[PDB]
Symmetry: D2
Subunit: 220 residues, 4 copies
């Protein structure tokens, strides 16, 4: 069901502060190494008047390196796939709601994404594009009511030095009955590796690895 | 804007990733702060979530403002205004909504988007255990050249008790209008009739602005 | 059990950002009018290095004018009295936890108050003492699990124009079994009407009236 | 200034839902290994009517294994020491505010701790004592306005299976000017390894290591 090399195709439709936009992307990754890359192009609503960073973690936890001792909720869910919903609550009150319906077509994952952010102040780092990148993160994942949740408090680094904080709450919903994991973590590091001046073209990379917290490197 | 105004709207949105669409027509008295409308589900019916989460998204021009409080909303017309809102429920369900309000003759026209996520399957929204919104008192204050609206309100539940929700609204006039001081708007929104699956809903709202704790028999 | 004219007596012990202080107060009020006033004196930790405004709503909903049609949880609770707990979550991350144990001795209410605030940033309006007053407010009150709850997002007005937000969460607990009210509101207006330069002496007033919202 | 083997002595005074208590502890740890253990004794307010787990994070980031490439804010701050403030916001509205004034006397760290929790519902896992342990955690540390912050969203596992989440906001403040670190992480694992029936006596352990997350 999951090959060492998989493809990605996606379409996001959404709006920020009431202004609509759409983005499509194609990409590739290796689910068992927890790495992926994709090229994104803005199809509608460009040039985007907000920080592109708010979108990137919406652009698939199957792309995470899961060790044998931790149950893989995401790799189990295919070929049927899974969906997820998320609220991203920034410290100045800007809040983004996002959904992704992930299906599988051959060796290609297909994402149907919706993205809606509101209440970003005009003078804030998002509407003024003062973000540099997301810091690496450690998400915490746990079962509630038969599905998997993901909470993480992370931050964006800012232009003039400093960090802009954001609280993530994600619900992951397998479409099939799968085995549920215990409490565990996923480290992330997402990076924009190239882009043009107004971000109509973006090359996006992510590396993610699951673990169980403070413990195996016993020199043997 | 006349004593009798019309309302015409369309909402497109999704809840927990499930899309839907609703259209509505209505009428109101902006200076008396009263309005009513008939709503029809066009797509995604029957809705699998509590209809109440939508009602406060379905126009502060319909609020009775005393002369001593600057009316941000009536000033903004004929150009109109837009607003954005997050509604944060106490079990983590969160709904984001926007409304672009324009004016065509005597009819206000709304373009509405609504997106809710993370409503638990066993919660009062997905199980349709809400009864109504309680009356509320919103607080409005200027920030960064625009008007904000905060209110922590609640829905009454079927088996008793209340389900909380924190509202954060930003109101944005499309033209330069005069800015009010800190003030309040009392609300009471009510569904007065509906059919079995809420495909048809008659919705009413009464709203009055005031200045908090200050009729002296004269 | 509650007279038209009652007195107030209190002591607050607490800390803000780890710096301790203590304040005592004496006052008077009219419970059926929803009005009260008191004189507060800093006994320890002066001169206070934080905005005095963060303390004032901590300095008794018995001082609220309740109409006949709304159940009065607080006047019912006496002579045994009641207690309350509260979290005050300001929009920049400063957070104050407070409790009040209210008893009655003759015609005087006695408050035992604890107050603890943390994470107020050095450059914020509280530590820089740039607050003017609390705005008038409308608290929302509702029953949850047999006790009375009070929620309200209110604000402090700032010196150069502007407002500093705060989300209140209060739990009211009668010491005896009393009758529970329906969902209702309490309008507030608290004001510092006089103070000395470093707020070691403060005259504080409050006016409060309960109601049920629109239509009335 | 900082040896491989250090001792701990502390006193916590506090209250939860208005009911006060006091606890003293003595312990030892290895700052460069990020490990510590201590014995805690309830002196006042026992038997504690709330889940002991809510207090364990409050019972010193100097006990964290820092790699050379990450600036160590806490080991730098001594012998003068540092203080911290923290808000712990539980998902059912219970909120605990805590402070620690950490000083050093010879080879012993001395803590002066205050702890105040409010709004824990009567039927919740804290008041009903249905907590098992804190899960392992990863704290995020970053500078803001010249001091060090620590944010982390963790959880307590519950008796019958499940988790009760909590939002952790800490400010770390050195008593002297020390050098500021970049954005980094601290992995934790705190565990109660033994206790008597009503937690009058508690043996508490913590293991902590700093790191920089997944690389670029």
């Amino acid at each position: 069901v999951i090959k060492p090399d998989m493809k990605i195709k996606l379409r996001m439709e959404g709006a920020v502060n009431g202004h609509p936009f759409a983005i499509e992307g194609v990409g590739l990754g290796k689910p068992f190494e927890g790495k992926q890359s994709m090229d994104l192009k803005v199809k509608e609503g460009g040039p985007l008047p907000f920080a592109y960073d708010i979108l990137t973690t919406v652009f698939n936890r199957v792309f995470a390196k899961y060790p044998e001792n931790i149950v893989d909720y995401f790799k189990q869910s295919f070929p049927e796939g899974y969906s997820w919903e998320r609220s991203m609550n920034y410290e100045d009150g800007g809040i983004c709601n996002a959904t992704n319906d992930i299906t599988l077509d051959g060796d290609c994952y297909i994402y149907e994404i919706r993205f809606d952010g509101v209440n970003f102040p005009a003078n804030g780092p998002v509407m003024q594009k003062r973000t540099v990148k997301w810091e690496p993160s450690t998400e915490k994942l746990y079962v509630r009511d038969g599905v998997l949740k993901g909470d993480v408090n992370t931050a964006l680094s800012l232009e003039g030095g400093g960090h802009y904080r954001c609280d993530f709450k994600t619900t992951y919903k397998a479409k099939k009955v799968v085995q549920l994991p215990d409490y565990h973590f996923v480290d992330h590091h997402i990076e924009i590796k190239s882009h043009d001046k107004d971000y109509s073209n973006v090359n996006l990379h992510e590396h993610a690895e699951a673990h169980s917290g403070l413990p195996m490197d016993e020199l043997y």
